[PDB]
Amino acid sequence: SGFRKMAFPSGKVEGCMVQVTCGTTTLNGLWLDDVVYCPRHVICTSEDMLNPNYEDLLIRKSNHNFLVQAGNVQLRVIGHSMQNCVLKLKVDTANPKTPKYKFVRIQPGQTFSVLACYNGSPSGVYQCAMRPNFTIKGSFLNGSCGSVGFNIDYDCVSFCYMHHMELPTGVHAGTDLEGNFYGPFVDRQTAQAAGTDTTITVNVLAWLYAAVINGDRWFLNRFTTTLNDFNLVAMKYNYEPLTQDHVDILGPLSAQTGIAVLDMCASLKELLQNGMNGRTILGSALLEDEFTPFDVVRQCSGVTF
């Protein structure tokens, strides 16, 4: 028993992290096969970041403008190209530690592990969620760019995130590994704002199921609700609509505990309307939304990678 915010084991990804230097600008890259991937803003000076023309900037570089370093070893760059907001540097050496991998794009509400790196060296691992507004609430300092986010599935590393920027509010934005941003953001140092965030309702219900599985049961009332009446209350608290697909996804946890989804929704309704009243669920005085249904099932069953 017990329930922790848990990341995937990071070993497979640690042996893909490299340092990428272009001029004064230095960040991380991901080395897979014979290609190193990193944010395209590596080619910018600090003055260029204010209004970059990435076509013109990259045309004015060639291979010898890029220093890639794996440990002590320099990898020699032999080609360069840009796909969306990521730079692809081709190197002469294939990474011998390349895992089985996929590049995947995730949805809002889905979770992933971040391996935070500085100078090509992994420093920390943490779990987070893609917010409804397409940000992540991460922990990232200067130099963290090129740190990746991942899930593991059946030995395959599914890479889903590459870090690019921090927004004024202190939340983070980045791309998938094919360079497409999550969210209405651009890789330019200019004023940007994420929109109003919302709570991921299906994940709250999942974590309430995790609480029941671990013995926290005080919030379970004898009331019930329709899905419609639930969504009408939940919408007033900035919670996402719960769809029937979400109800279906909570199916397994509902079957495991014996608590119907809509009865857990009636429990959540009363927690929103009345409060916690000084009590805690799983060690928290607020409702947690960064565990998916599948994370609950995985952690409360012992699945290995």
Residues that bind ligand A1AD0 (CB under 6 A): 27, 41, 49, 140-145, 165-167, 172, 187-189, 192
Is 71 one of the binding residues for a copy of itself (CB under 8 A)? no
C-beta neighbour count of 277 within 10 angstroms: 8
Rg (CA), the chain: 22
Cα 192 to Cα 180: distance, rounded to the nearest angstrom = 17
Asked if residue 291 binds a copy of itself (CB under 8 A), the reply is: no
Q: Give yes or no for residue 249 binding a copy of itself (CB under 8 A).
A: no
Residue 80 and residue 37: Cα distance in Å, rounded? Answer: 10
Judged by CB under 8 A, does residue 1 bind a copy of itself? yes
Shortest distance, CB of residue 221 to ligand A1AD0, whole angstroms?
A: 30
User: Do 135 and 288 touch, CB atoms closer than 8 A?
Assistant: no
Active site residue: 16, 22, 41, 246, which one?
41
Tell whether residue 208 is a contact of a copy of itself (CB under 8 A): no
Separation between Cα atoms, residue 191 and residue 168, nearest integer Å: 8
Scanning 89-200, the segments in alpha helix (DSSP H) are none
List of residues 6+ apart from 118 with CB closer than 8 A: 28, 141, 143, 144
Please indicate whether residue 41 is annotated as part of the active site.
yes
* Annotation says 44 is catalytic: no
Task: Find, among 138, 100, 120, the residue nearest to 7 by Cα.
Answer: 138
DSSP character for 42? G
Nearer to a copy of itself, 10 or 198 (CB): 10
- 119 binding a copy of itself? (CB under 8 A): yes
Min dist CB 265 to ligand A1AD0, Å, is 31
Shortest Å distance, C-beta 139 to a copy of itself: 4
User: Could you say whether residue 161 binds a copy of itself (CB under 8 A)?
Assistant: no
27 binds, among a copy of itself, ligand A1AD0, none (CB under 5 to 8 A by kind): ligand A1AD0
68 in Cβ contact with 29 (< 8 Å): yes
Q: Which of 38, 117, 128, 145 is catalytic?
A: 145
- Cβ burial of 178 (10 Å; 0-12, 13-18, 19+) is middle
Residues 261-290 that bind a copy of itself (CB under 8 A): 276, 280, 283-286
Residues forming the site for a copy of itself (CB under 8 A)? 1-12, 14-15, 115-119, 121-126, 128, 137-141, 143-144, 166, 170-172, 214-215, 276, 280, 283-286, 298-305
Query: Among all residues, which ones are annotated catalytic?
Result: 41, 145
